[PDB]
């Protein structure tokens, strides 16, 4: 009793945004690529090899958005031949795997750094930062290939308008065709989102349970109380935190009570950026990754007629917001990265 047809068009709302984002994006990652390379030194911060890589994939993406800005503008008309439609598409997914793979190497930096599972000679942090960055780019390009090979152009539906689209006609037969849509889709998001995002959640966890316990400096005599070491000479064993130390405890060095101590909140900015990145990363990339995952569950749990169409005319949006998640890391480094903000003022002056 049920039929399938689009929602009231958004006009040029998306292609507008697409250009806005190409505009801010090409100019915003343009910087964090100079700011990291304006520095020539071995004063490159650990988590900088990944911020560069983050900028490059966000960049190679947003440069193509003039292409996707017209195609969505002429209501799906691709006048750029099969090559670009292949290649341009191929770079949507390249960026998406890279952006994920960076944001966890960005995080696996802070786990290696801020928990140090092995001793510091064997921690090999630059290499683990740098071997990470190489095999990163090789995955995100390799596993992005079925979108290079299979995406073709073609006027579906008899309408005098070309469409760029995934064509399972090499790989599939007409009944198994939806299978390759589903498998190549649950691959993408799985490797693309659920594996990375839980990794970053896994990393983000172990960081807090060691970040958990707090050092404490004696405000009068200077002695610092680390909960790993403790003060076992005075009864209070290691691994204990400060508020549990019996309230009769006093400074081992001078003997003022707990009344005069001072928790150090060791100002880290590397970690605080890496989450604001991730928590907006996983806020823009969740929609597109929730719906594509419901709709390929939606052919294979048999969702009502209502739903499948819903999730189809929902999608061009979720694409478009997850697409902006590129031209935001440039803004986030501004509102939050010290090394970044400073490296800007500096060039400014000179001219």
């Amino acid at each position: 009793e049920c039929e399938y047809t689009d929602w009231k068009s958004s006009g040029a709302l998306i292609p507008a945004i697409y250009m806005l984002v190409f505009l801010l994006g090409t100019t915003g990652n343009g910087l964090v690529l100079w700011t990291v390379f304006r520095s020539s030194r071995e004063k490159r911060r650990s988590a900088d090899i990944f911020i560069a890589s983050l900028a490059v994939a966000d960049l190679t993406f947003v440069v193509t958005l003039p292409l996707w800005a017209t195609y969505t503008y002429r209501d799906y008309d691709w006048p750029f031949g099969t090559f670009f439609c292949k290649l341009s598409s191929y770079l949507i997914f390249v960026n998406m795997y890279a952006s994920a793979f960076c944001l966890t190497g960005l995080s696996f930096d802070r786990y290696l750094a801020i928990v140090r599972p092995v001793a510091n000679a064997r921690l090999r942090l630059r290499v683990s930062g740098a071997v990470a960055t190489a095999v990163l780019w090789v995955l995100a390009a390799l596993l992005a290939m079925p979108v290079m090979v299979l995406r073709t152009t073609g006027d579906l539906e008899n309408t005098n308008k070309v469409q760029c689209y995934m064509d399972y006609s090499m790989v599939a037969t007409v009944s198994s065709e939806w299978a390759w849509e589903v498998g190549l889709g649950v691959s993408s998001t799985t490797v693309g989102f659920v594996v990375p995002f839980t990794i970053m959640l896994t990393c983000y966890f172990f960081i807090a349970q060691t970040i958990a316990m707090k050092k404490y400096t004696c405000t009068v005599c200077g002695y610092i109380y680390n909960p790993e070491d403790g003060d076992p000479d005075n009864g209070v064993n290691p691994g204990t935190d400060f508020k549990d130390i019996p309230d009769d405890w006093v400074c081992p060095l001078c003997g003022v009570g707990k009344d005069q101590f001072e928790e150090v909140e060791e100002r880290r900015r590397l970690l605080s950026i890496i989450v604001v990145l991730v928590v907006t990363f996983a806020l823009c990339k969740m929609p597109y990754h929730l719906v594509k995952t419901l709709y390929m569950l939606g052919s294979l749990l048999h969702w009502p007629c209502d739903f499948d169409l819903f999730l189809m005319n929902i999608f061009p949006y979720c694409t478009c917001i997850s697409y902006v998640n590129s031209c935001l890391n440039p803004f986030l480094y501004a509102f939050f990265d010290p090394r970044f903000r400073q490296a800007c003022t500096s060039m400014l002056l000179m001219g």
Epitope: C2, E157, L184, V291, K292, Y295, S299
Partner: nanobody, 129 residues
Framework: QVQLVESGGGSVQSGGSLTLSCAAS????????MGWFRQAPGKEREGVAL???????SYADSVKGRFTISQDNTKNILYLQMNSLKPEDTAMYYC???????????????????????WGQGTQVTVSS
């Protein structure tokens, strides 16, 4: 793994009310679209009433306003309600079906690509004077 069986069409006289089921199997609304053709014969094959991505249904200029078409994912069946029938609509009707595309394309029915998709025997309709 996909079958389509046309049932409903015999002989009716002008101005009649026919309705033609295309009971479908293996197909999914989610992955597949549905449409109707016909042959005279002595002529060619011609699209009648399809189920499109963009417009609700793309009728042909001749059958427009007379035929009504509907899907029913519940029992998975495509319909063709023919009202006020013309003898030039004397012909044998088949239902096809076609795969759509990853929503990255727009869930677009591949109507044109090849119409070497899921077909059926056709059912034949006869309109006399």
């Amino acid at each position: 793994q996909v079958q389509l069986v046309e049932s409903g069409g015999g002989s009716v006289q002008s101005g009649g009310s026919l309705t033609l089921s295309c009971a479908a199997s293996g197909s999914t609304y989610s992955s597949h679209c549905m449409g109707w053709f016909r042959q005279a014969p002595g002529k060619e094959r011609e699209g009648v009433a399809l189920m499109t991505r963009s417009r609700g249904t793309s009728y042909a200029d001749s059958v427009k306003g007379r035929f009504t078409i509907s899907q029913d994912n519940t029992k998975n069946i495509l319909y063709l309600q023919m009202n006020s029938l013309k003898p030039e609509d004397t012909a044998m009707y088949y239902c096809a079906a076609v795969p759509r595309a990853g929503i990255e394309s727009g869930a677009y029915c591949k109507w044109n690509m090849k119409d070497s998709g899921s077909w059926g025997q056709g059912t034949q309709v006869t309109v006399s004077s």
